[PDB]
Amino acid sequence: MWVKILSVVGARPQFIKAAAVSRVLRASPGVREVLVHTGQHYDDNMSQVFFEELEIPDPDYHLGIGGGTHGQNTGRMLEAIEGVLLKEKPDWVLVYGNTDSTLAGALAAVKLHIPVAHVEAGLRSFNRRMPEEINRILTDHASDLLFAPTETAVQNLLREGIPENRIHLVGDVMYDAALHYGAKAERKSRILERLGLQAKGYVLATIHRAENTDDQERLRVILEALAEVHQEVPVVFPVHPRTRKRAEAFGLGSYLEKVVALEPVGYLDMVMLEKNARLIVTDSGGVQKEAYFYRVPCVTVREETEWVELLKAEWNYLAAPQNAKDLALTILHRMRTKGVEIDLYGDGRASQKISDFLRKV
Amino acid sequence: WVKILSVVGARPQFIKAAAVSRVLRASPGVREVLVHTGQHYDDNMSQVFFEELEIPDPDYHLGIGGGTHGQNTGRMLEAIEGVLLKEKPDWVLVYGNTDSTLAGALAAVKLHIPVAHVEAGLRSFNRRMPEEINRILTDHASDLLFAPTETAVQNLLREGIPENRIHLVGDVMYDAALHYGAKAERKSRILERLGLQAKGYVLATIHRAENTDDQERLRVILEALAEVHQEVPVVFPVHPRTRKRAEAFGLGSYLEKVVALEPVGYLDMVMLEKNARLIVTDSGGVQKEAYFYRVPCVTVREETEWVELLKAEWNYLAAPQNAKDLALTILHRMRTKGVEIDLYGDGRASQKISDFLRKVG
Ligand SMILES: CC(=O)N[C@H]1[C@@H](OP(=O)(O)OP(=O)(O)OC[C@H]2O[C@@H](n3ccc(=O)[nH]c3=O)[C@H](O)[C@@H]2O)O[C@H](C(=O)O)[C@@H](O)[C@@H]1NC(C)=O
Ligand SMILES: CC(=O)N[C@H]1[C@@H](OP(=O)(O)OP(=O)(O)OC[C@H]2O[C@@H](n3ccc(=O)[nH]c3=O)[C@H](O)[C@@H]2O)O[C@H](C(=O)O)[C@@H](O)[C@@H]1NC(C)=O
Ligand SMILES: CC(=O)N[C@H]1[C@@H](OP(=O)(O)OP(=O)(O)OC[C@H]2O[C@@H](n3ccc(=O)[nH]c3=O)[C@H](O)[C@@H]2O)O[C@H](CO)[C@@H](O)[C@@H]1O
Ligand SMILES: O=c1ccn([C@@H]2O[C@H](COP(=O)(O)OP(=O)(O)O)[C@@H](O)[C@H]2O)c(=O)[nH]1
């Protein structure tokens, strides 16, 4: 009767995915849900605020593992998570996205013959030097079920020999999350007030990819470009903590004072800020999809994206950070554009289709 | 001129590394560093190979072993990453498909260090095996893939890995057998010491987890060997996990009904394999080695990765379901030979491999 579904989460974006799938498994007939928090994101504004605001039950476990190397974080999460799998003996392990926590969770489980489902599977940058590309490839190939959010993602899995019958195109659970919590965002978040921002009276930015923040010249191009954009249209920038650290370390911390820079915000503020932005500048996977949700034009500050449908649809645009002034003009040019009318990422019921496919198989 | 670091951990890894390291020591300017994970630590599992096979002492002994998948893999991951940051090698070489192989590849790849997999692309199609996971994830984590067979090339192509990263080089274990054959013949008295002549016994090894971790499959095997022994002597160098399982299950007494040894060194092993009437094994290398010597083999498994041995009739699977049948199969196959065919290359897989590591850029 009770299938036990154990969820491994470690990062902000995973807490948000999980909140959509938890909601649905909670009120599932005879499903017990166990939640493990790897500890990867520990700070109040990267972790706790999402459990509080998205009504996610307290983790059954917090492994408290974070802030080391790839080897340390992964290695220990592997040992710790196995310890919990041995105690809890679940029927399914679900992993999310593509961090070291995703891979450690999966790898812990497959070695115990515990089935593994990958929520958000089959995405590819085709840059194998990226640690996130390796995590998603190794995760997909270790899983038993692959919950694809797009047709591209499905073709990507088929191309690497993974069979039809283990792939389910379910759309994106982060679209579910945006539907379920938008109202709560309306009636709780006053961030437009607190910042004194008029709706569609600003540009919203996030930047945290390692290929953008570890490289001084890239990080400088971006912060220069955003400060120019701000002269013309205010830039709001909840600054990822690693990004903050890197810009302080290379002596770029002044460009952050020259825009409206914030510590990281919870999901409800973020929804509000995203919704009411004239345009969104990001290097985030989640934020670029979210821009499309609200039909706000987007610029992706990378050489590629895994979300190729947003480019085809013209809601999203690549601007690699080679030149501060070029990137500024690209941003400012794109804010009076829009994309075509199209429905991606499903019906807002990816989580429920996932719940269903898990009680059958 | 270029630094190549090897991660070995267990007996079959030392035998493969031996062949390759012999070629690399000849190569102009190539420094080798050798990391022994600690996975095998008994002297007749580790030390003996280093001595008889002329392998320089490991540059590092991490001393990890005896734990779960989680524990070993995790601790190895962190530890190898430690060495790799110290040694900053240009290449990491990983062999076969133990937990050490995988910790090796994962440590290396998150550090942007090229990984070459010796013995790449083999597939059991059984994901319950820890070792199937191991080679799948290793192959997907590698930049070079030294495949030993045309099957393994095909296996890799079907999982989306490009032709340009796959090289069919043959098997370094044939290079091994070839180079150490005269030495084993000259130095091994294993026959004298046991009181055996040629062709007047049967050699057996068993250590798969799937065979040893399950009481009833192990009983089947031990009883079937005990029966065969009544008809033709059975010589059984017993893996320590296999002995420790036999003791914990009460099945110790079966090992008196055969010629049970402690594990032997490569030199004694060659002589045993060479002069056997039939080999019965759940081992990877031993299957191939039985064909090296034109000795019929029986593989006490549900599948093998070495499928060409079945097609050429050198080998024959016999899953352990029934003591009486397993014994019968074993005795029947004594009367068979395979077809004359060359497999596994010309004995210079190690040179091809060295050649590729140097001229890769
Ligand atoms: C490039 C890359 O690999 N990315 C992977 C990465 O996600 P990601 O890039 O989106 O990181 P991230 O931007 O922190 O999260 C966004 C969320 O935070 C919210 N968000 C953002 C900022 C903020 O201040 N407050 C806030 O609530 C936003 O509203 C939004 O909902 O980790 C994910 C994970 O493992 O699950 C993978 O699915 C991704 N893989 C892909 C392919 O997109
Ligand atoms: C089933 C499986 O995955 N197997 C993998 C496994 O090796 P394996 O199954 O062959 O274990 P194993 O039999 O201990 O050693 C054989 C050698 O020991 C010598 N040997 C054996 C017994 C003895 O007493 N003395 C001795 O010298 C023999 O002469 C012989 O040369 O780990 C390997 C590794 O990671 O490198 C993978 O390459 C293998 N994958 C394959 C695909 O064969
Ligand atoms: C999951 C994994 O990596 N499996 C590999 C491992 O099997 P193997 O059976 O050796 O797996 P482990 O390395 O986990 O060792 C199993 C157990 O054997 C005992 N032990 C081990 C080594 C030793 O010197 N003394 C001793 O007593 C310990 O109790 C240990 O836990 O190496 C074999 C080589 O022979 C390979 O065929 C297997 O693919
Ligand atoms: O709660 C948190 C999470 C992360 N970080 C910082 O942000 C970095 C992000 O690294 P993490 O391992 O979390 O993410 P990855 O880059 O591996 O996806 C960490 O190293 C820390 O410097 C932080 O300050 N607080």
Residue numbers in the entry:
A (entry chain A): 1 to 361
B (entry chain B): 2 to 362
Q: Can you quote the paper on this entry?
A:
The focus of this investigation is on the ORF WP_011172736, which we demonstrate encodes for a 2-epimerase. Whereas the sugar 2-epimerases that function on UDP-GlcNAc have been the focus of past biochemical and structural analyses, this is the first detailed investigation of a 2-epimerase that specifically utilizes UDP-2,3-diacetamido-2,3-dideoxy-d-glucuronic acid as its substrate.
In an attempt to trap the UDP-sugar substrate in the active site, we subsequently constructed the D98N variant and crystallized it at pH 7.0 in the presence of UDP-GlcNAc3NAcA (structure 4). The model was refined to an overall R-factor of 19.5% at 2.2 Å resolution. Unambiguous electron density corresponding to the UDP-substrate was observed in each subunit. Surprisingly, however, in subunits A and B, there were also electron densities corresponding to UDP and UDP-GlcNAc, respectively, albeit at lower occupancies as can be seen in Figure 7, A and B. Importantly, these ligands were not included in the crystallization trials. In subunit A, the β-phosphoryl group does not lie within 3.2 Å of any protein atoms, whereas in subunit B, it forms an electrostatic interaction with Arg 242. Although the electron densities of the exogenous ligands in structure 4 were unambiguous, we utilized a combination of protein denaturation, HPLC, and mass spectrometry to verify their presence in the purified protein before the crystallization trials. As described in Experimental procedures, they were identified as UDP-GlcNAc and UDP.
